[PDB]
RNA sequence: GUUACAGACUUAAGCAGUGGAGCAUGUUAUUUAAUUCGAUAAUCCACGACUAACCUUACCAUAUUUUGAAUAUUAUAAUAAUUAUAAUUAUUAUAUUACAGGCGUUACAUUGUUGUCUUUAGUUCGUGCUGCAAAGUUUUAGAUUAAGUUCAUAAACGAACAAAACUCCAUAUAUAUAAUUUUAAUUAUAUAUAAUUUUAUAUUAUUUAUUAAUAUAAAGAAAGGAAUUAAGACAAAUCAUAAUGAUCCUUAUAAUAUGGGUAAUAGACGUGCUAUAAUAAAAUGAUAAUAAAAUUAUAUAAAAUAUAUUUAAUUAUAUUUAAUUAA
């Protein structure tokens, strides 16, 4: 050690040099130097101390303990800013989050579409694109504990690309409604299915399927009938493609129990004209179609 | 300057960023007494390219104040956002202490690395005052950033044996002093805080001493031969403490059994390197 | 408080204590149920 | 990251920072001046007084300031500038404090009390009394005109009516 | 070539040196309390530092013993006295004694300390000075001439950019170096 | 981490780093021999906070009224001088101040920040020096969240927020505080948290026997003083690549919310007459780098967890009285 | 006024007690001008209250004050300070709108805090699955644990408040500090390590060592206490710590002084103190057998003296303050 000016004067600053001189001509050279492992003093890091480092050492002109510059001294003036903000990248997003962003005007369809890929293959744009959501069944459900009432949210909701597919979905929340609706969008989207339409616009023949309580009796429509049926049921085919139809329900009047009564009837409870033809061996003709024809 | 902001006729030509510190600086140091001034306008609406600001905006805020950045802005700020989500770009409160008390540290590193070692200029050799010339000690007691009443206090201490006193004389001295004295340790001891600075007490102390040293030497009325040294206060004293005045037996020491150092070869060759 | 408006006249403080004390006195007297007036020495003898 | 600006740290500066029982007499002079400063309100532990402010101008060193019985509220005196305040230097206070000085009050012989009274015996009764109060006043912490006052009439010399009664 | 790291910033990083006791003298014992630890070690370790580079020998922070106090106290606001907490309150001691120093240095020091003081630390000096048998007390005249002599030579000032001054001490000095003072001492 | 094998026999939570110091439970940090000196000085303390608290509250207009939440004064005591410390939480912050109109006028904010200490004679600290006999400083410290303390989220959600819970609490305001922080993996950032810790260790370790089986080859046994010697080399190799931009960002303590609850308790809603009290219990409210690592908890004032942070506040509606409890944990 | 299973000084055993006597203290009841108020099953009753002569004190008697304890509004005048006889400011006095003040009522309007269930082991959420659904699952067949503790199977896989752990006193060891006259180093207090012990053998029942309890062995200094008492319920306690809502008083339900009461006593009651004698009481025991933890700037008060009291000692006052504002 004890080094000379060279390489010294052209590294530490000039005020700086008459503090080093007399260091060293101070502590004798060849002293020992224990380390204290009952009080910590230094830094555990090495560090010259000769620049006044942002974030780490007290602002100048800060009104702080340890503050030399007077009273009358004090340099800091604008309080609008947080001084002294944090130093390099200047964030601690800490290793696999994600800086939030709009959230209010992102759609919570994005958020489903994105969960669904995640967990299963499904594609998001389809989601958010081709799918659209409307609510069914929305009502406060309250179950008792020795606490006392729990209410419950629970929604039920329908998704269908008015081309083919539709989906039922129901989901529970306590915390809020729109919990209870996102769930129900999640449970929907999973439960898709296929619905098979007579020419893109109505079922095949009638059908008079019976859902628990629930009689459904629904009947075929004329080309530019319209939705002459049971608001569920409407709101149903409005999202499943299905524009002309005419139904009545009996016995029990169960939205719920309407909306999934409806959707099994149309999965299975119907049948194709080809399935019909190749089980039959026989062919089926639509006179309507034929009749047009070249 | 320092009042280079009380004077805004030489700010022309300043910088822009300068010129809107000293502004800041003039109505924050001045206050309620603050007073606009045209020369402060001037050198202001220099800086309207800097800060992006119309000429006539500066000159509204300059006269309006916070109601003119109000009626400008067109409509209050109607948003809650206090509950805005975290950016990550703060610390919590507790973590900023944490980092004040390292900026603490930091603080007293520097000053120990490069403000200290200019506090060896003011070494001085210890110019030893000579113990037979300097054998009364006096005790101050000061409280640093307080003002507690013990801070009068002054003790006086001397051995008896150094006041330089004959045998007589030191007989009528230890006896006078009473419970002052113990003669276990031959010091004399004596504390006064009567008075209401430490300077008054230490004259009472010198001068109670210089009293009783008269009268010890002046042997023409009494010697005080024939009554002897009471030391009852001291009996009570040393009674209240534990007396370990034991020592291992001189003859019970076997010398003989402790271990001797044996060869170490490799420490035998390494002396010569 | 009362000594700030002396040191510091430019800045304007509410003291909310003070504020909530008018409040419920304004309250109270619109509610019918204000403070009795005080009778003074000179009634009577 | 600005650069560290060394100030040299001097005596003069580490000055204000003595102890203030410090046995050199040096210290007690250095002590002596600060004490009077203080006594005369000359700006220490706060920001001194300039011109710049006209009207904000404010001390809370007056008299009855901490003391309740001057039933009054704050007084907001008005602050001398830096220049024209004055500073007591009480001869009393350096005798007190620069040097060690105690008055140890004032012994009465019997040619005082023979002054009021003449039987021997209660001449020699305020004698002992004269000398216990003597020896039990001077370690009592009040003023010496108060403390000469309770001693006189203790005594017997002044009657009890010289006291607030 | 690399970086060089002087004493003055490598001493930083260890242990306070302290210097060796000559003659055994005692000068000055300070007594550092405080209601914690932390801050009392860090500050004590800067007393050592400051006394070594002022050529002060010191022995270093001696563990006092603690205090405990003790108070107990009901938990419900009226009526629980059967339920009852305790309280305790520790004062954390530590004792430095410096040896073989002028009066004048040791001023130096504890001037140091006070100035860059810490939160919570409270400190106590007891000073011991030794003297005369008999002492010349109506010395003053004299005394007070060469005393203000030597102050004026302690709180000298050589360079200019350096050495930062306070406004106090500014005042002191001009009021001790009045002429005004002499007049101070002609009472008689 | 538990393991420690390749370092040795060490360790050091002392770092002003890692731990908040024990002075920092305690609002009056001072001790004087004098102890009526001490209890003036506490009582002070309090008197002042609280005239700070009337300070606060500004308005500009009818229309315009200002509240700035601060936290409970940290008062600094040293032998020579007294600092007051607080954070504080400005909302009106017009923009975040995007606009550069803000460079030419003064909020009301800003002017009483700068009497606080900037303002000549007449700042508050020439009066607090007359009552404290020493040098006064206060230190404002801005909050540009209201989540950061406990003491300034209950004081806003207890004194601005009445309209929101007064009948009820409304679902987009339950949902924001809910909202407030990310949902972060407290075991993850524990884990990171000890790995480097070991990563510094073993850095450190490694520099102690590369120095000290090469030390350039010259000092060698007989030479070093193996007696009572320990200085080892060149503190340049002591801590090679171990500077102040890696390490001690990477090591402070207590960075993010994991954890927070709210507790609304009074007469708020107005029912038949009863009280109600809703709570809001939002992620976890226990540390994970203690229990795995080697660091301790350390309980403030005996009865908190460091990584706990919490407190309530009262006011009055209506009704009568209600209280505001939100406790914060800090990983 | 339902069944089964375990704990806990619940019980059994042991030691000491209460209930019996006298006294101290709280309560009831009664008396009284007042015997102020509250607590009053466990969860009140030497409780709020860590000391009721005056104060305190909230009660009774008799006298006495009326914008009073602040905050604001408007006039009149006086004093002090600072600038060059004037100007400004701060305070004081006299008024009035204006209230202030309340231990008055409501713990069944409240904040906060607290007692009991309670060191008890419970209380919930995300995704998945089951039932049309409310819901359920997880939170369990069977065992173990102090414990939703840990396993085994199981639509479940995780997580949060509780459990445990971190924490504090104490323990063993290492390093450091202390010029071993603040001594005791047999200590003090800072950092760290250690155990929620490990290993081996055997005898057991078992899901077969891919194991539990029984003992042994040997390696260890290694064995305790404190804090923390969840969710809900008791409309449990508190408006007499303090604070607010509503209602009530404003020459009186607000404020002051002199006395008294809170200390009364038929009965009853819960806590304790002291005794009813010889495995137990009394005197004496000066190289003064042997402690720990606490206190002394609103002080602690030694030694020596006179006294009762005899030579002295012990015991209680008085005389006088030694030292110390404390390893
Ligand atoms: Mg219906
Ligand atoms: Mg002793
Ligand atoms: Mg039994
Ligand atoms: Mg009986
Ligand atoms: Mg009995
Ligand atoms: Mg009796
Ligand atoms: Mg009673
Ligand atoms: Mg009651
Ligand atoms: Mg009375
Ligand atoms: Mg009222
Ligand atoms: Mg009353
Ligand atoms: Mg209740
Ligand atoms: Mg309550
Ligand atoms: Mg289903
Ligand atoms: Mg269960
Ligand atoms: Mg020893
Ligand atoms: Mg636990
Ligand atoms: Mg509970
Ligand atoms: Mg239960
Ligand atoms: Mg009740
Ligand atoms: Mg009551
Ligand atoms: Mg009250
Ligand atoms: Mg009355
Ligand atoms: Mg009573
Ligand atoms: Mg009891
Ligand atoms: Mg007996
Ligand atoms: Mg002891
Ligand atoms: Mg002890
Ligand atoms: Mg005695």
């Known amino acids: 050690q004890h080094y000379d000016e060279s390489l010294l004067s052209r590294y530490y600053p000039e005020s700086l040099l008459k503090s080093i001189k007399l260091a060293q001509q101070t502590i004798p050279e060849d002293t020992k130097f224990r380390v204290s492992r009952n009080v910590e003093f230094a830094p555990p890091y090495l560090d010259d101390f000769t620049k006044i480092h942002p974030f780490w050492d007290y602002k100048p002109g800060m009104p702080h303990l340890h503050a030399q510059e007077e009273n009358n001294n004090f340099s800091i003036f604008r309080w609008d800013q947080v001084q002294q903000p944090l130093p390099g990248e200047g964030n601690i997003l800490p290793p696999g989050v994600s800086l939030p962003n709009d959230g209010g005007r992102k759609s919570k369809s994005a958020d489903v579409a994105a969960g669904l890929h995640k967990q299963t293959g499904v594609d998001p744009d389809y989601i958010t694109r081709k799918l659209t959501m409307k609510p069914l069944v929305m009502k406060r459900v309250s179950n008792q504990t020795g606490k006392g009432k729990i209410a419950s949210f629970y929604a039920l909701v329908v998704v269908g690309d008015k081309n083919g597919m539709v989906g039922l979905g129901e989901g529970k929340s306590r915390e809020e409604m729109s919990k209870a609706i996102f769930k129900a969008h999640w449970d929907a989207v999973r439960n898709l299915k296929e619905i098979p339409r007579y020419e893109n616009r109505t079922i095949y023949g009638d059908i008079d399927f019976r859902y628990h309580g629930v009689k459904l009796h629904l009947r075929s429509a004329k080309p530019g009938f319209g939705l002459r049926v049971n608001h569920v049921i409407f709101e149903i085919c409005e999202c499943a493609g299905i524009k002309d139809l005419s139904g009545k329900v009996y016995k029990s009047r169960n939205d719920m129990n309407i909306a999934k009564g409806t959707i099994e009837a149309f999965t299975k409870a119907q049948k194709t004209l080809d399935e019909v033809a190749l089980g039959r061996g026989k062919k089926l003709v639509d006179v309507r179609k034929v009749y047009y024809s070249s | 300057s320092a009042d280079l902001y009380m004077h805004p006729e030489k700010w022309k030509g300043l910088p822009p960023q300068r010129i809107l510190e000293l502004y800041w600086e003039r109505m924050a140091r001045l206050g309620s007494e603050y007073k606009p001034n045209k020369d402060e306008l001037n050198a202001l609406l220099t800086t309207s390219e800097y800060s992006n600001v119309p000429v006539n905006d500066i000159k509204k805020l300059y006269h309006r104040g916070e109601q003119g950045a109000i009626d400008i802005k067109g409509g209050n700020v109607n948003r809650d956002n206090s509950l805005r989500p975290f950016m990550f770009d703060e610390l919590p409160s507790q973590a900023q202490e944490l980092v004040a008390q390292h900026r603490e540290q930091r603080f007293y590193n520097r000053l120990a690395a490069y403000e200290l070692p200019l506090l060896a200029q003011y070494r001085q050799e210890y110019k030893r005052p000579s113990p037979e010339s300097h054998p009364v000690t006096y005790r101050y007691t000061s409280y640093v950033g307080e003002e507690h009443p013990n801070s009068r206090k002054v003790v006086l201490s001397v051995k008896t044996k150094e006041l330089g006193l004959e045998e007589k004389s030191l007989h009528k001295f230890r006896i006078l002093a009473r419970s002052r004295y113990d003669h276990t340790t031959d010091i004399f001891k004596m504390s006064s805080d009567k008075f209401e600075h430490a300077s008054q007490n230490a004259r009472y102390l010198h001068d109670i001493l210089q009293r009783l040293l008269a009268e010890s030497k002046d042997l023409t009325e009494d010697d005080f031969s024939d009554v002897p040294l009471d030391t009852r206060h001291t009996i009570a004293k040393s009674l209240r403490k534990k007396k370990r005045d034991y020592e291992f037996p001189e003859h019970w020491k076997r010398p003989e059994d402790a271990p001797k150092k044996k060869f170490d070869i490799v420490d035998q060759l390494l002396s010569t390197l | 408080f009362r000594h700030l408006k002396t040191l510091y006249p430019d800045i304007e403080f509410v003291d909310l204590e003070e504020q909530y004390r008018l409040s419920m006195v304004e309250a109270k007297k619109r509610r019918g149920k204000g403070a009795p007036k005080k009778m003074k020495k000179d009634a009577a003898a | ?165 | 070539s690399t970086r060089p790291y002087p004493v003055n910033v490598e001493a930083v990083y260890y242990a306070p040196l302290k210097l060796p006791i000559k003659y055994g003298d005692l000068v000055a014992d300070i007594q550092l309390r405080s209601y914690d630890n932390e801050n009392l070690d860090f500050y004590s370790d800067f007393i050592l530092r400051t006394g070594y580079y002022l050529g002060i020998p010191l022995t270093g922070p001696k563990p006092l013993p603690t205090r405990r106090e003790r108070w107990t106290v009901i938990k419900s606001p009226f009526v629980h006295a059967k339920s009852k907490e305790n309280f305790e309150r520790h004062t954390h001691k530590r004792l430095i004694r410096a040896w073989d120093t002028n009066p004048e240095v040791l001023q130096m020091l504890i001037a140091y300390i006070t100035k860059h003081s810490m939160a919570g630390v409270g400190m106590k000096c007891n000073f011991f000075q030794r003297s005369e048998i008999s002492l010349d007390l109506g010395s003053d005249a004299n005394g007070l001439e060469k005393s203000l002599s030597n102050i004026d030579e302690l709180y000298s000032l050589r360079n200019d950019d350096k050495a930062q001054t306070s406004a106090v001490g500014q005042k002191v000095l001009e009021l001790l170096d009045s002429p005004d003072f002499k007049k101070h001492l002609e009472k008689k | 981490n538990p393991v420690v094998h390749r370092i040795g026999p060490a360790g050091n939570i002392n770092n002003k780093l890692q731990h908040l110091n024990n002075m920092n439970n305690w609002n009056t940090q001072i001790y004087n021999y004098n102890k009526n000196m001490e209890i003036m000085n506490t009582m002070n303390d309090k008197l002042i906070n609280k005239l700070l608290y009337k300070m606060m509250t500004l308005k500009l207009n009818n229309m315009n009224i200002n509240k700035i939440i601060m936290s409970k004064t940290i008062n600094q005591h040293s032998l020579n001088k007294l600092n007051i410390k607080f954070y504080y939480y400005n909302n009106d912050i017009n923009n975040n101040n995007n606009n550069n109109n803000n460079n030419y006028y003064m909020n009301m904010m800003n002017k009483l920040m700068n009497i606080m200490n900037n303002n000549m004679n007449n700042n508050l600290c020439n009066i607090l020096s007359y009552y404290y006999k020493k040098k006064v400083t206060i230190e404002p410290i801005k909050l540009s969240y209201i989540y950061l303390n406990s003491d300034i989220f209950s004081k806003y959600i207890s004194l601005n927020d009445m309209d929101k819970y007064n009948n009820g609490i409304l679902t987009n305001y339950q949902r924001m505080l809910n909202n407030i922080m990310p949902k972060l993996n407290d075991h993850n950032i524990s884990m990171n948290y000890i790995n480097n810790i070991n990563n510094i260790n073993n850095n450190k370790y490694n520099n102690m026997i590369n120095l000290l089986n090469n030390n350039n080859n010259i000092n060698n046994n007989n030479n070093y003083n193996n007696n009572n010697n320990n200085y080892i080399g060149n503190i340049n190799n002591i801590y090679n690549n171990m500077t102040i931009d890696n390490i001690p960002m990477d090591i402070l303590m207590y960075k993010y919310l994991v954890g927070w609850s709210i507790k609304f308790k009074g007469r708020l809603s107005n029912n038949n007459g009863r009280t109600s009290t809703t709570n809001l219990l939002n992620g976890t409210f226990n540390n994970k780098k203690y229990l795995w690592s080697n660091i301790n908890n350390n309980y403030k004032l005996n009865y908190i967890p460091s990584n706990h942070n919490l407190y309530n506040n009262s006011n009055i509606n209506k009704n009568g009285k209600y209280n505001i409890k939100v406790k914060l944990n800090f990983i």
């Open chain 4, 1 to 165: 990251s600005s650069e560290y600006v060394l100030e040299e740290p001097t005596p003069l500066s580490l000055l204000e920072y003595t102890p203030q029982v410090f046995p050199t007499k040096e210290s007690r002079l250095v002590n002596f001046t600060l004490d009077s400063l203080k006594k005369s309100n000359y700006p220490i532990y706060r920001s001194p007084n300039l011109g710049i402010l006209k009207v904000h101008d404010f001390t809370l060193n007056t008299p009855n300031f901490g003391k309740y019985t001057p039933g009054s509220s704050l007084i907001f005196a008005k602050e001398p500038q830096l220049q024209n305040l004055l500073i007591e230097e009480d001869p009393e206070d350096f005798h007190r404090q620069v040097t060690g000085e105690y008055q140890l009050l004032k012994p009465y012989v019997k040619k005082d009390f023979e002054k009021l009274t003449k039987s021997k015996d209660t001449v020699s009764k305020l004698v002992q009394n004269s000398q216990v109060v003597r020896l039990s006043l001077q370690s009592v912490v009040m003023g010496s005109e108060e403390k000469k006052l309770v001693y006189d009439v203790c005594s017997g010399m002044k009657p009890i009516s010289e006291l607030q009664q």
